[PDB]
Design a protein around this ligand. Structure first.
Ligand code: SF4
Ligand code: SF4
Ligand code: SF4
Ligand code: SF4
Ligand code: FES
Ligand SMILES: [K+]
Ligand SMILES: [Zn+2]
Lengths: 54, 95, 48, 126, 688, 208, 108, 86, 114
């Protein structure tokens, strides 16, 4: 995972020991991270062709 | 420790039991009501209180990462025993 | 489990039960909460 | 010129597909939402909201769940200004109630006022 | 103009002198994070979260306390500001317990929210945390002092708003504990509001504990009906069940505070309810029946009555819609004998002009007054937020308060003039020094309590206070826009009933006893079956069966204030409207719907079918009942004071005492609170 | 900012800004706004009346050659008087790039269909007619493509609720699948998850 | 359950807040000894998508996704599990769930 | 049968109620000394038109407009209301 | 106030299109009765068509009635070919929904709704 604990949840051993890890685990599995505003279109090569997300 | 209602129905650990005039007992006739006979309150009341020689204690529930988050319990009051918030285990300063 | 038995506990069932669907011993769903609103029972004495 | 002159009010009541029961009996509310007093942030009181009146919610016979029959029970609409919300309200033919925005009154804070000489604003302790 | 120029992130803005950095940043639009700062409490500055950086200066300054000067550029998003915030919150979370899953503050915790916003992402603390011994401060506020961060909002609230001075900090260093140092109960009018202003889960609500979560509760903005203050509240429900009640920010009434009764009457609101219509059987007992049967019996009794044979008593928690529907239904049979349980003196000017039964200045008018005279009232228990406003003006604006009545504890030092009503005669004559004190006052204020009008000489007391107010207003240095004569009410359904032309007091019913009676939740017990004739068809319409329901022939289940959209007028004439949070249980319906259906059955159909048509009828009877959150002035004090002198009512020699003297009598007043278990627990706690 | 922060591409940003200036100065009649996002994407907000003269340009100019139509989208924002935002995504295989063209319309004003530019849009904007109600003028076959045959209303509008106003169930009296007003056994629990604290100061709108 | 008989859940409502199909319904109240315990814990198996968000968002390892997959029923309402059925399933499959958690807990 | 209550809705700022206000300042108290049992409810509003409401027996409510009416006009209207009783 | 028209420059062309759509529906009804094997008469289908046309009789906007004509033509095309089933055609006749209460008294009896 990414080491940004405000986006990816922390390790379960760290959640039961640290305080900031438990707070981030709570706010990530209840509310979720905040995405900056804006619009994007990301396309990959799926086996059926161009698979896009707007 | 499951008590039996006068209608014959069993009472859950929550205390839910259908009344005598409640029609919804038609869901139980010809079948069974699923209740659990291992009550958590009675089983946690059988756990002995642990005597420790410290002012504060740390509880994680046992097993390390397989338990609850670690918390700290103060045992300054001697009249009552400090109880863990998650596991329900109670500790006491022996002084 | 003959060489590595599981850890025994007090609450674990000692008698395994197979799929009981369609049998009289099948699970029946029900609410597990008490009554919310308690109604006002009238008095059992006339006003006279 | 490829343009026409239309002078009548807007009416999209017959195009939205909503039944008339949820048009002539509903009462929308346009308001700036109240700040949660348990917290201190003010970011939830920035945009106007349109909400609908609460209808009947009853208990399920089987599991006790909150059964409902109101399709507009969870419809919250967000608007930047009051005029946009009121135009969206009268466009769809909904009767509305508009609540004014309650901006808090600014105070006059002073740290020295806790240590006055002849006034009653002396702090008992700190 | 004394406005000076400051800069926030390079953006210029005008500020007043004495403005803090936090207020200037808020005026630009930036909300600096804070823990100990409060806009309604004194500046403490003991958390160091608000440390913002001023450019060209080698130190961070506390934005919650630093006064700005000219030429300052404030950097709210620089690097060292964020470094200071991260270090301060790392220190804050170093000793915080891992109690988030078992916390009621989770999901609405300020510490969690700014830890996600401005805090770091991991903890470098590799030591052992502290553990504070818990405390008990009553059955309302649950105390877990392991989670307290020592922000000292407790001390400032209990010292500057509640005026108790019983909370403090004992210790020095990391072992300093915020508590009371003894087994003392923090019982007050506003003892629940600390739960509102605790940024952590240290102080929680004991009835609400372990019940719901803030992210799954729907918030409905409504109006409190528990007293005549008219507090704006938010009802937080969850799937058709009311969970809690929180304050709403209204700068004119209840700024962000509510009394304990308002916060904790909901569990009694969901107890001892009326669900189905009962009628009397052949043995005289109440048995359940359909709506059609009970309505047909009531309409059949009503059809045989005409003139003075049918009357009505209004309750204390009745909306204007139900009141006007019952008034129209009783006017269809030519019956003007409509009464309320609370008594207001009708001798003289009466309920004709709106000047002599309203708090004419405002709730906020105490902020402009300098001398306030309270006559025969106990405002701590009757209107707690009005007493809070008086205390705020006393602490800040140096208000002078004097009291006539019993020497009750009002959490400020007043001048007790005695409990003799004839002392009032001394002010109207001038033999008392307080007459000169009122004469030299630029903005005087005379407040008469509604509990003092319940006595036999209420007309005499009203005449004396009106004489005092007119003597002061026409002889002292009053501008003319100022309103002196004020009356503080205690019933939410009182001003709305008086504006509809009801007759206050049940003496008209006692003068000519009716044959059938209507009770709109009148549970005061002012009228019993012994006063009434032998065969009286008492019809009770309400939600709780307390007093009038055991003596009723037909019980009609109505709706509470959280279950209907209803119009209530507070003590200053400001109309407000509640909203439907949940629906009435069982077969209970809205009150005006019941009255209109009863008129439909009886062949006397009323000309309104929806709520808006009833509101149009309300506007027909009086316009100011449909203008919400709009205070309408009430002039013509001179005419009322001239008409009041005709009836020379004589004051009795008995002293003026209120019905509420201690904290014991506050919790159980009407049917909503008397059917509550939390209020019963509070009474049991304060008695022992 | 090395291992966690996504790397920034500045050459693509400069090239897209230059091409945006190129497009804006070529067509000053229809182009209203040109913007480049932080992750190097170009948006050309244009007038609806230039839906056709812009797109064919990007299809036929020797310096654009946007021969592929990737996605045709519509965004419903009720806070504007022109609540519908039609967005075209174009892919250029020759110059290996992507562009975005945005336009606005309300419920009643029709916009010109681009079936004469890209034929894939023959279905795509038809989908919009099924779910937003934006009528596309001069279309070969415009009808419903995803909803039920007797369905009324446009589901992807924001004022349309999550559950519909009708539901289907089998009735044995009429031996038929019938439509009835909806009655959910359990209500969809609406969650209030917005944090009350400001998150991104870079997007802070100025106050009124 | 904890290895003393006490049930692990403390009614924190993270699982019902993270469940994407809203299959989890939780209602809680303080019980006799003042412990934060559930009163209603319902999982709709016909709503559940079996993705393990609840078993990974649980801070005290209370709810788990056991290895049983042969539990098809003949009636729709039998797939509406209340708290008693889930507790019975936990007591039935604890001897396997504990071993699976002991095997896989180091990857989390 | 007869009168039951009188309702006068007026304004405090607009001049259209001005003469009506003149009535309340000159010919009310003595009028209140002539009808000791007749409830005459005076209601002020911020932006209402002048209005006079008369209630008879059995809910018969009649309406009279009083916009731009002087003291003599509103006095004469009140005498017509009091002496009509229809 | 100048807007872009859809099909009709004023009300006359729009009501002419409404008239033509009504003629097409009236001609089409017996064919949908015959092909779908409905158990109703032709007069019932024609009066249902008249009721559906008179439901939107209060529209005084050329663009709104143009969109209504477009949707009616779409439904007519969907019912000329058998793309609708018997259920989709019969859904205009609410044969399974009981009539709701109408007056105030029955609505007071059966629930809290206005
Ligand atoms: S007060 Fe806040 S940070 Fe502390 S345990 Fe409760 S939710 Fe967590
Ligand atoms: S208990 Fe709460 S409000 Fe009181 S001092 Fe501690 S953190 Fe502040
Ligand atoms: S596994 Fe099932 S119950 Fe658990 S979060 Fe996923 S969908 Fe919900
Ligand atoms: S099962 Fe786990 S995640 Fe769900 S409420 Fe209980 S402790 Fe929280
Ligand atoms: S908010 Fe300024 S130091 Fe606490
Ligand atoms: K709190
Ligand atoms: Zn533990």
């Amino acid at each position: 995972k990414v080491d940004d604990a405000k986006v990816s949840p922390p390790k379960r051993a760290e959640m039961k020991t640290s305080m900031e890890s438990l707070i981030h685990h709570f706010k990530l599995y209840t509310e979720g991270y905040q995405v900056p505003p804006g619009a994007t279109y990301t396309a990959i090569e799926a086996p059926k062709g161009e698979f896009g997300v707007y | 420790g499951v008590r039996t209602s006068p209608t014959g129905e069993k009472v859950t650990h929550t205390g839910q039991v259908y009344d005598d005039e409640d029609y919804r007992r038609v869901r139980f006739v010809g079948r069974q009501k699923e209740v659990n006979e291992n009550f958590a309150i009675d089983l946690i009341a059988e756990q002995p209180v642990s005597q420790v020689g410290s002012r504060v204690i740390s509880c994680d529930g046992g097993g390390g990462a397989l338990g609850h988050p670690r918390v700290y319990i103060n045992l300054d009051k001697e009249t009552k025993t400090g109880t863990c918030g998650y596991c329900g285990l109670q500790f006491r300063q022996q002084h | 489990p003959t060489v590595k038995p599981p850890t025994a506990r007090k609450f674990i069932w000692t008698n395994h039960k197979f799929n009981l669907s369609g049998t009289p011993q099948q699970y029946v769903p029900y609410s597990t909460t008490r009554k919310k609103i308690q109604e006002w029972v009238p008095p059992s004495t006339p006003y006279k | 010129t490829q343009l026409i002159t239309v002078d009548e009010k807007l009416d999209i009541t017959t195009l939205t597909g909503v039944p008339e029961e949820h048009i002539k009996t509903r009462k929308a509310r346009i308001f700036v939402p109240a700040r949660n007093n348990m917290q201190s942030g003010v970011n939830n009181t920035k945009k106007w909201k349109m909400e609908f009146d609460t209808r009947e919610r009853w208990e399920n016979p089987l599991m006790g769940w909150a059964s409902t029959a109101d399709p507009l029970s969870n419809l919250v609409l967000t608007f930047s200004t009051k005029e946009d919300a009121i135009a969206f309200a009268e466009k769809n033919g909904w009767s509305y109630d508009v609540e004014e925005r309650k901006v808090p009154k600014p105070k006059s804070k002073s740290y020295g006022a806790n240590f006055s000489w002849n006034k009653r604003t002396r702090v008992s302790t700190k | 103009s004394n406005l000076i120029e400051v800069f926030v992130d390079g953006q210029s803005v005008m500020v007043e002198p004495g403005t803090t950095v936090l207020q200037a940043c808020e005026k630009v639009g930036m909300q600096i994070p804070r823990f100990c700062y409060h806009e309604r409490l004194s500046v403490a500055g003991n958390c160091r979260m608000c440390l913002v950086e001023i450019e060209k200066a080698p130190k961070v300054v506390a934005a919650c306390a630093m006064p700005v000067m000219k030429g300052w550029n404030i950097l709210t998003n620089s690097e060292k500001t964020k470094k200071a915030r991260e270090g301060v919150m790392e220190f804050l979370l170093a000793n915080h317990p891992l109690d988030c899953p078992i916390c009621d503050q989770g999901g609405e915790c300020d510490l969690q929210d700014q830890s996600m916003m401005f805090g770091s992402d991991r903890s470098r603390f590799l030591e052992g945390k502290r553990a504070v011994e818990d405390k008990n401060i009553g059955p309302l506020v649950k105390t877990i002092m392991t989670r307290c961060i020592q922000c000292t909002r407790c001390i400032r609230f209990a010292s500057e708003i509640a005026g108790v001075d019983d909370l403090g900090t004992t210790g020095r260093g990391n072992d300093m504990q915020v508590g009371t140092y003894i087994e003392k109960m923090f019982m007050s009018e506003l003892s629940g509001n600390i739960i509102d202003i605790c940024p952590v889960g240290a102080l929680t609500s004991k009835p609400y504990a372990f019940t719901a979560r803030p992210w799954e509760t729907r918030k409905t903005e409504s109006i409190d009906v528990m007293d005549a203050v008219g507090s704006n509240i938010v009802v937080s429900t969850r799937t058709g069940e009311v969970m809690r009640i929180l304050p709403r920010m209204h700068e004119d009434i209840n700024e962000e505070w509510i009394s304990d009764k308002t916060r904790f009457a909901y569990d009694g609101l969901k107890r001892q309810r009326l669900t189905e219509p009962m009628v009397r059987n052949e043995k005289g007992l109440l048995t359940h029946t359909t709506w059609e049967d009970a309505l047909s019996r009531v309409a059949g009794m009503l059809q045989s009555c005409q003139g003075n044979d049918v009357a009505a008593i209004a309750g204390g928690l009745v909306d204007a819609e139900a009141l006007i529907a019952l008034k129209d239904l009783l006017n269809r049979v030519d019956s003007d004998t409509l009464c309320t349980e609370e008594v207001f003196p009708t001798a003289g000017a009466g309920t004709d002009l709106r000047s002599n039964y309203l708090l004419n200045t405002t709730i906020a008018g105490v902020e402009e007054a300098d001398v306030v005279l309270l006559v025969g009232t106990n405002p701590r228990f009757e209107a707690p937020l009005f007493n809070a406003r008086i205390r705020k003006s006393w602490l800040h604006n140096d208000l002078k308060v004097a009291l006539i009545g019993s020497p009750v504890d009002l959490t400020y030092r007043y001048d007790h003039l005695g409990d003799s009503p004839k002392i009032l005669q001394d002010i109207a004559s001038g033999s008392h020094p307080f007459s000169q004190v009122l004469q030299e006052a630029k903005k005087p204020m005379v407040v008469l309590g509604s509990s003092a009008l319940q006595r036999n000489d209420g007309a005499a007391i009203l005449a004396a206070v009106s004489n005092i107010a007119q003597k002061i207003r026409t002889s002292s240095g009053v501008t003319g826009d100022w309103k002196v004569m004020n009356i503080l009410h205690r019933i939410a359904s009182q001003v709305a009933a008086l504006d509809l032309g009801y007759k206050p007091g049940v003496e008209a019913i006692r003068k000519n006893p009716p044959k059938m009676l209507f009770l709109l939740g009148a549970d005061g017990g002012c009228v019993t079956r012994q006063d009434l004739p032998k065969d009286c068809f008492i019809v009770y319409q309400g939600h709780h069966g307390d007093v009038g329901a055991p003596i009723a022939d037909v019980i009609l289940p109505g709706a509470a204030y959280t279950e209907k959209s209803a119009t209530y007028v507070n003590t200053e004439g400001r109309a407000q409207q509640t909203k439907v949070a949940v629906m009435p249980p069982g077969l209970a319906r809205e009150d005006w719907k019941i009255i209109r259906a009863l008129s439909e059955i009886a062949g006397m159909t009323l000309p309104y079918d929806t709520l808006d048509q009833v509101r149009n009828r309300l506007e027909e009877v009086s316009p100011n009942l449909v203008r919400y959150d709009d205070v309408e002035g009430a002039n013509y004090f001179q005419q009322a004071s001239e008409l009041s002198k005709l009836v020379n009512q004589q004051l009795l020699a008995d002293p003026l005492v209120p019905p509420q003297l201690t904290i014991k009598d506050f919790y159980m007043t009407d049917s909503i609170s008397r059917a509550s278990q939390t209020m019963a627990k509070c009474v049991k706690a304060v008695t022992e | 900012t090395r291992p966690t922060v996504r790397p920034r591409n500045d050459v693509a940003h400069k090239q897209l800004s230059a091409f945006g200036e190129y497009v804006a100065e070529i067509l000053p009649k229809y182009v209203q706004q040109v913007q480049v996002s932080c992750f190097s994407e170009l948006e050309i907000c244009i007038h609806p009346d230039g839906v056709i003269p812009v797109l064919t340009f990007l299809r036929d100019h020797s310096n654009a050659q946007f021969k592929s139509l990737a996605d045709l989208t519509a965004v419903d924002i009720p806070t504007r008087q022109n609540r519908f935002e039609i967005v075209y995504n174009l892919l250029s295989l020759r110059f290996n790039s992507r562009i975005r063209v945005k336009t606005y319309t309300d419920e009643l004003t029709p916009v010109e269909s681009s079936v004469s530019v890209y034929k894939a849009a023959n279905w795509y904007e038809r989908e919009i007619w099924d779910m937003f109600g934006v009528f596309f003028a001069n279309h070969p076959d415009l009808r419903r493509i995803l909803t039920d045959y007797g369905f009324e209303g446009h589901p992807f509008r924001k004022d349309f609720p999550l559950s519909g106003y009708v539901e289907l169930r089998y009735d044995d009296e009429v031996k038929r699948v019938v439509a009835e007003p909806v009655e959910l056994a359990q209500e969809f629990r609406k969650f209030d998850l917005n944090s009350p604290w400001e998150a991104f100061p870079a997007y802070r709108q100025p106050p009124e | 359950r904890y290895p003393s008989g006490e049930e692990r859940c403390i009614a924190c409502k993270l699982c019902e807040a993270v469940c994407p199909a809203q299959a989890i319904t939780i209602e809680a109240e303080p019980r006799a000894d003042g412990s934060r315990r559930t009163t209603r814990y319902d999982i709709d198996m016909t709503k559940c998508i079996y993705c393990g968000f609840c078993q990974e968002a649980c801070p005290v390892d209370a709810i788990v996704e056991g290895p049983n997959f042969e539990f098809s029923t003949e009636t729709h309402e039998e797939l509406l599990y209340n708290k008693e059925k889930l507790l019975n399933n936990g007591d039935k499959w604890e001897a396997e769930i504990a071993a699976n958690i002991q095997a896989d807990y180091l990857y989390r | 049968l007869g009168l039951r209550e009188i309702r006068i809705h007026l304004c405090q700022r607009s001049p259209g109620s001005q003469g009506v206000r003149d009535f309340i300042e000159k010919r009310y108290v003595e009028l209140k000394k002539a009808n000791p049992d007749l409830p005459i409810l005076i209601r002020e509003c911020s932006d209402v038109q002048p209005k006079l409401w008369a209630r008879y027996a059995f809910g018969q409510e009649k309406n009279v407009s009083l916009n731009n009416f002087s003291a003599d006009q509103v006095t004469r209207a009140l005498e017509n209301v009091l002496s009509s009783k229809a | 106030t100048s807007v872009k028209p859809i099909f009709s420059r004023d009300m006359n062309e729009a009501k002419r299109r409404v008239r033509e759509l009504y003629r097409a529906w009236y001609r089409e009804v017996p064919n949908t009765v015959h092909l779908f094997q409905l158990d109703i008469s032709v007069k019932q289908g024609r009066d249902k068509v008249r009721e559906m046309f008179k439901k939107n009789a209060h529209v005084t906007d050329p663009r709104v009635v143009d969109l209504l004509v477009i949707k009616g033509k779409m439904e007519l095309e969907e019912t000329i070919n058998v793309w609708k089933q018997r259920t989709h055609v019969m859904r205009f006749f609410h044969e399974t929904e009981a009539p709701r209460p109408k007056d105030f008294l029955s609505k007071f009896y059966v629930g809290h709704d206005p």
